[PDB]
Amino acid sequence: NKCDVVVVGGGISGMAAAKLLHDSGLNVVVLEARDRVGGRTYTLRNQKVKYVDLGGSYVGPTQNRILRLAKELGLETYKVNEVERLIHHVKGKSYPFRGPFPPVWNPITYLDHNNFWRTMDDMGREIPSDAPWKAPLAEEWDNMTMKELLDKLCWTESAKQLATLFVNLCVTAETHEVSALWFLWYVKQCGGTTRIISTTNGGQERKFVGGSGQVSERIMDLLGDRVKLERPVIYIDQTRENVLVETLNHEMYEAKYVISAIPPTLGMKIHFNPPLPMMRNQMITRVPLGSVIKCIVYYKEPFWRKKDYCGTMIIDGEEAPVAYTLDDTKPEGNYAAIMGFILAHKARKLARLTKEERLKKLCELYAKVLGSLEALEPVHYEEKNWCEEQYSGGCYTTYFPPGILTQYGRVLRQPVDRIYFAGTETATHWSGYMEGAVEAGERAAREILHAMGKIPEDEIWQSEPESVDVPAQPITTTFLERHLPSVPGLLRLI
Amino acid sequence: NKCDVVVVGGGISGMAAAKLLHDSGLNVVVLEARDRVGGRTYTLRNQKVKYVDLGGSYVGPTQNRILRLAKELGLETYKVNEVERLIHHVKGKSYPFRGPFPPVWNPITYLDHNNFWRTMDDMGREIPSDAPWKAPLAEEWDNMTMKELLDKLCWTESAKQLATLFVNLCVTAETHEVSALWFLWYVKQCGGTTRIISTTNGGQERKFVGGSGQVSERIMDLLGDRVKLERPVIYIDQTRENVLVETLNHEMYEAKYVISAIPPTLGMKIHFNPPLPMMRNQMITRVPLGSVIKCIVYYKEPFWRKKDYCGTMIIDGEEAPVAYTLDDTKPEGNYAAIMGFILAHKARKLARLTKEERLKKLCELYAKVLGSLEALEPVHYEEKNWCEEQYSGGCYTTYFPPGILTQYGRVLRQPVDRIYFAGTETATHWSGYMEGAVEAGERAAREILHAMGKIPEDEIWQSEPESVDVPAQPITTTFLERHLPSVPGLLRLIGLTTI
Numbered sequence: 001n002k003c004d005v006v007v008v009g010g011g012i013s014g015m016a017a018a019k020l021l022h023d024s025g026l027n028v029v030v031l032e033a034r035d036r037v038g039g040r041t042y043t044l045r046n047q048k049v050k051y052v053d054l055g056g057s058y059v060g061p062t063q064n065r066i067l068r069l070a071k072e073l074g075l076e077t078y079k080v081n082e083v084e085r086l087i088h089h090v091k092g093k094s095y096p097f098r099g100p101f102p103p104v105w106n107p108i109t110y111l112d113h114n115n116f117w118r119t120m121d122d123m124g125r126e127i128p129s130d131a132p133w134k135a136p137l138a139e140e141w142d143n144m145t146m147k148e149l150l151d152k153l154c155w156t157e158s159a160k161q162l163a164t165l166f167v168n169l170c171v172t173a174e175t176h177e178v179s180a181l182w183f184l185w186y187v188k189q190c191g192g193t194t195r196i197i198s199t200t201n202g203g204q205e206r207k208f209v210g211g212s213g214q215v216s217e218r219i220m221d222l223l224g225d226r227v228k229l230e231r232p233v234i235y236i237d238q239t240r241e242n243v244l245v246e247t248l249n250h251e252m253y254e255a256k257y258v259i260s261a262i263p264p265t266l267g268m269k270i271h272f273n274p275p276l277p278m279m280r281n282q283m284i285t286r287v288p289l290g291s292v293i294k295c296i297v298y299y300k301e302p303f304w305r306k307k308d309y310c311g312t313m314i315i316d317g318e319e320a321p322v323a324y325t326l327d328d329t330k331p332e333g334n335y336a337a338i339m340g341f342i343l344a345h346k347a348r349k350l351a352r353l354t355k356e357e358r359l360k361k362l363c364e365l366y367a368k369v370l371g372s373l374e375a376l377e378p379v380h381y382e383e384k385n386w387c388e389e390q391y392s393g394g395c396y397t398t399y400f401p402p403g404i405l406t407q408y409g410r411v412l413r414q415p416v417d418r419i420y421f422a423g424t425e426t427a428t429h430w431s432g433y434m435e436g437a438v439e440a441g442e443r444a445a446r447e448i449l450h451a452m453g454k455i456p457e458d459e460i461w462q463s464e465p466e467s468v469d470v471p472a473q474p475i476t477t478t479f480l481e482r483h484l485p486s487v488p489g490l491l492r493l494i
Numbered sequence: 495n496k497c498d499v500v501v502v503g504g505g506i507s508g509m510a511a512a513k514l515l516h517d518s519g520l521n522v523v524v525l526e527a528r529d530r531v532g533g534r535t536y537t538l539r540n541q542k543v544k545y546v547d548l549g550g551s552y553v554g555p556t557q558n559r560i561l562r563l564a565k566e567l568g569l570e571t572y573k574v575n576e577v578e579r580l581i582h583h584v585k586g587k588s589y590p591f592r593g594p595f596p597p598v599w600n601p602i603t604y605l606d607h608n609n610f611w612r613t614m615d616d617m618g619r620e621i622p623s624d625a626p627w628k629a630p631l632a633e634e635w636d637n638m639t640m641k642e643l644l645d646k647l648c649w650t651e652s653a654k655q656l657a658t659l660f661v662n663l664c665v666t667a668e669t670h671e672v673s674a675l676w677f678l679w680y681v682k683q684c685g686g687t688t689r690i691i692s693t694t695n696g697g698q699e700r701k702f703v704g705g706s707g708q709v710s711e712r713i714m715d716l717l718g719d720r721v722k723l724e725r726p727v728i729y730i731d732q733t734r735e736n737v738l739v740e741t742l743n744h745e746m747y748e749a750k751y752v753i754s755a756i757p758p759t760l761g762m763k764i765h766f767n768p769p770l771p772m773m774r775n776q777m778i779t780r781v782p783l784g785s786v787i788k789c790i791v792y793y794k795e796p797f798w799r800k801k802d803y804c805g806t807m808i809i810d811g812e813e814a815p816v817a818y819t820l821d822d823t824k825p826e827g828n829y830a831a832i833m834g835f836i837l838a839h840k841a842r843k844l845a846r847l848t849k850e851e852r853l854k855k856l857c858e859l860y861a862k863v864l865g866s867l868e869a870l871e872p873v874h875y876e877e878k879n880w881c882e883e884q885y886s887g888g889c890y891t892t893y894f895p896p897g898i899l900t901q902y903g904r905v906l907r908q909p910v911d912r913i914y915f916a917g918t919e920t921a922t923h924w925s926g927y928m929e930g931a932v933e934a935g936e937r938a939a940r941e942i943l944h945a946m947g948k949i950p951e952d953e954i955w956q957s958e959p960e961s962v963d964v965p966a967q968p969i970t971t972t973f974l975e976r977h978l979p980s981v982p983g984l985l986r987l988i989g990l991t992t993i
């Protein structure tokens with residue numbers, strides 16, 4: 001019935017918001033559509049896997065809010081295995097390498113590849129994190145897909161395939177589907193190409209012991225009966241003195257304020273009175289989520305480490321179901337496993353198959369990439385197709401098609417009367433990640449503390465001290481990386 | 495509570511479906527979200543306008559189903575005024591012309607222009623109406639925006655600017671927003687470039703006496719109390735023997751089948767049990783509608799006719815609020831009016847102005863374009879911003895961004911258990927129009943008649959006799975239009991001849 005704030009959605013963002021309001025002395029209710037909390041994080045437990053992250057999993061340096069929240073809740077991290085060599089599989093062959101991205105040996109291709117990622121970072125430096133529509137070339141860049149940008153920029157097929165794989169892996173969408181402006185903002189607001197792609201010293205450095213689902217679960221433990229499971233919100237009425245929020249199971253919640261902590265497009269599942277203003281009414285029809293099946297094959301031992309492979313595979317080409325993998329073995333060396341993503345159009349394609357059919361295809365691919373018959377002998381398999389989730393819409397995050405971010409992007413976090421907007425999509429650092437979810441939940445919470453007169457405006461956005469446990473090292477470039485010419489640049493000099 | 499078929503949506507599609515099902519003996523209920531039927535058609539009546547269409551309005555040759563439905567309901571059509579000259583306004587100057595598109599005198603530009611719409615129609619013939627994703631180059635065309643297609647095809651800026659305006663007018667979206675495959679399909683399934691753009695012998699030839707809103711209102715008259723206004727559907731449960739459909743005002747309806755006759759993305763407003771299959775689940779987050787404000791400025795007299803202007807203006811330029819107008823004078827010659835569209839990014843930009851400020855900007859534009867100070871003397875104004883409609887999502891219709899139609903297109907009208915899909919977006923001919931609404935509504939109803947064993951499979955898709963009142967002149971080309979080279983084709987002829 002009555003409270004101070006109703007939070008819609010019990011993902012990390014909603015939970016982080018609810019925890020902050022609760023800790024400040026307000027009465028909060030969290031309305032969650034599903035029979036669980038965690039949303040796009042989900043940790044499955046059984047005896048075969050012990051625990052496995054089937055959704056969001058990795059955290060790394062510069063993600064200081066999720067690390068502080070998780071540490072307070074009593075969680076600890078361990079490092080993803082990256083002691084041995086990475087593998088780039090291209091044109092049916094495996095090339096082992098060390099470092100964040102595969103070395104290029106052909107000198108023309110080297111120039112072209114080097115220029116491409118240098119250029120993504122250069123372009124990013126002109127895009128404000130909190131307002132990408134204010135980039136000097138915002139409209140130009142927003143009216144191009146990433147496919148067009150890559151066709152203009154890449155002179156070699158081989159750099160273009162690498163760059164395409166990069167886009168597919170970062171945002172689980174095809175290059176032709178996404179705005180260039182949006183994608184370039186996305187990379188930049190994670191701290192750039194190196195930081196976004198890297199395990200060591202990057203976004204995939206670490207996992208939580210026991211799974212990331214414990215973040216949402218432990219906050220639920222704190223809030224007790226204030227969290228209502230299987231309460232999908234259908235109706236929010238703001239015509240009266242207090243805000244009225246109705247659920248599908250026929251309950252009514254009354255509050256001074258609401259935090260919407262759901263993906264923007266899932267706003268469509270709610271009937272509003274009065275209707276939303278025009279820009280938000282259209283925006284929420286224009287912002288899909290990507291497509292991904294997360295797949296984990298278990299083995300008796302981490303047999304790849306014997307061949308001096310870490311388990312990371314970057315896999316080129318149309319025929320491979322999986323483009324990217326990481327070692328998902330536990331810290332102790334047991335429950336050996338490879339984690340792989342079936343991305344974008346391959347997710348639509350292979351979802352038709354049975355679970356056993358997908359396992360066979362993955363095992364045969366890994367046998368080829370890792371060069372071991374051991375890969376043909378899985379002891380267990382887990383997978384989740386996030387495309388089929390009614391209350392997520394896909395994974396990892398919301399992508400913006402061409403034209404949308406400049407026309408509608410301004411309204412993402414704009415309050416609608418007494419509704420404030422959270423969700424990772426509204427963050428300005430690591431938006432799309434669990435880190436963004438924390439930033440956005442806590443920021444929306446503090447917007448409401450400010451509307452209530454409890455805090456000054458300058459405390460709505462709060463900086464975060466660096467994690468002592470997971471410090472950031474500088475991102476560096478070499479002299480040659482910075483000043484080698486592009487392919488057209490070399491041509492002009494001839 | 496109990497019936498044979500619940501129809502969700504009381505637009506033309508829903509009402510056509512419900513009418514067919516009722517006439518064949520079944521017990522139907524229509525659940526409509528709004529306090530009125532008609533959806534994206536809406537006829538306003540007051541003493542200043544008598545009546546005016548603020549949404550869907552025009553019908554034309556080849557739209558035989560809406561013409562038949564309208565005629566059986568006791569409606570009549572009249573011709574939109576195209577007696578005098580059209581105007582093309584570009585770079586601040588007005589160029590009167592006759593015929594469907596502004597003729598191009600600069601020969602190079604002529605070749606480029608000619609080639610552009612010829613290539614639109616050529617590519618269109620590659621694309622099956624009922625399965626655009628089966629075109630031989632479906633993938634390549636779908637992975638491209640219309641902006642990229644026009645940048646490759648137009649060797650002159652003037653052709654490119656005309657092509658851009660064509661896309662904005664047809665689908666109320668920017669060239670960079672829409673899939674090339676989708677747009678080429680959309681045009682082809684309307685009968686091609688000429689048919690879609692034309693007043694005489696095209697989509698905009700006629701209007702209903704009294705407004706298009708009467709189609710929905712008259713079917714509601716025939717169905718009586720079976721139509722339920724202010725029943726937004728929130729929940730559809732298919733787990734039991736009978737389908738359960740729940741509304742926001744707390745009513746439960748129980749049926750054998752459901753027709754969903756709402757724009758695909760407004761399917762998001764419904765919670766499904768069991769959950770939708772993956773492909774539909776994602777598809778309905780990927781298919782927005784366009785952006786338009788429809789504006790009608792009333793004048794003492796249709797003063798433009800006296801200058802030998804019919805009232806049609808094709809207006810190119812960033813400063814121009816309105817890109818296209820038609821004469822909206824009553825057939826009796828009174829309530830003189832100009833109907834205009836504010837399209838795509840201009841809808842967004844100008845929505846933040848007041849009604850009075852928008853009227854002012856339109857008048858100043860019309861005055862310049864028509865060369866007439868009388869345009870600054872309006873007697874009345876009406877407008878409707880469709881972008882602000884919770885239960886439409888925009889107008890005229892749904893567009894597909896790059897990559898969506900090939901990946902998700904095949905599930906648009908794929909039934910989900912005992913839910914069948916209508917709405918104009920699921921039609922194969924004049925999808926996006928009132929015609930497509932009628933086609934899709936009647937087809938979905940007949941899918942259900944087949945499921946119930948009342949008709950054979952070959953009667954689901956039914957052809958439509960040609961209107962005797964609105965006969966279709968065929969679309970013809972001249973020899974020169976068919977065989978004149980493109981710009982790069984001419985350049986090839988030049989390089990070859992000089993060797």
Ligand SMILES: *Cc1cc2c(cc1C)nc1c(=O)[nH]c(=O)nc-1n2C[C@H](O)[C@H](O)[C@H](O)COP(=O)(O)OP(=O)(O)OC[C@H]1O[C@@H](n2cnc3c(N)ncnc32)[C@H](O)[C@@H]1O
Nearest residue numbers: 009011012013039040056057058233395423424432433434
């Ligand atoms: C799915 C996924 C995500 C993911 C990733 C891999 C996959 C396969 N890998 C990641 C990673 O390694 N590291 C990382 O930091 N993030 C990763 N991601 C993304 C990450 O999981 C997400 O950014 C994050 O979990 C998003 O959190 P947020 O709190 O913003 O959103 P959410 O989890 O979707 O929660 C929304 C909740 O709202 C409920 N809901 C939806 N509709 C309603 C209604 N109408 N009423 C009530 N509740 C509603 C949802 O059920 C959900 O719980």
Ligand SMILES: *Cc1cc2c(cc1C)nc1c(=O)[nH]c(=O)nc-1n2C[C@H](O)[C@H](O)[C@H](O)COP(=O)(O)OP(=O)(O)OC[C@H]1O[C@@H](n2cnc3c(N)ncnc32)[C@H](O)[C@@H]1O
Nearest residue numbers: 503505506507527533534550551552727889917918926928
């Ligand atoms: C908006 C517009 C449309 C239009 C046009 C100009 C404008 C500004 N010009 C046209 C023209 O000149 N000639 C023509 O043939 N078409 C033109 N268009 C398009 C035309 O209006 C539409 O194609 C057509 O009206 C679509 O009919 P359909 O029946 O397919 O779709 P609808 O009208 O949107 O009806 C949907 C109904 O469903 C209700 N609804 C929505 N959600 C719910 C829920 N959850 N529960 C119950 N009911 C729901 C809507 O309220 C609506 O009545």
Ligand SMILES: CN(Cc1ccccc1)Cc1ccc(COc2ccc3c(CO)cc(=O)oc3c2)cc1
Nearest residue numbers: 058100101117162165166169170193196197204396
């Ligand atoms: C193909 N690419 C080329 C390249 C790109 C940029 C700069 C230099 C070279 C190398 C590369 C290496 C590793 C990656 C991995 O990137 C990600 C990005 C986001 C995630 C996420 C998102 O949360 C989850 C995850 O499990 O793994 C990820 C992995 C991408 C691209």
Ligand SMILES: CN(Cc1ccccc1)Cc1ccc(COc2ccc3c(CO)cc(=O)oc3c2)cc1
Nearest residue numbers: 594595611656659660663664687690691698808890
């Ligand atoms: C700019 N263009 C150039 C061109 C386009 C194609 C072939 C040759 C030249 C000419 C032109 C002229 C008129 C039009 C008008 O097109 C439409 C399309 C759909 C509608 C619709 C859709 O319902 C409603 C309406 O009131 O007006 C429309 C008007 C478009 C294009």
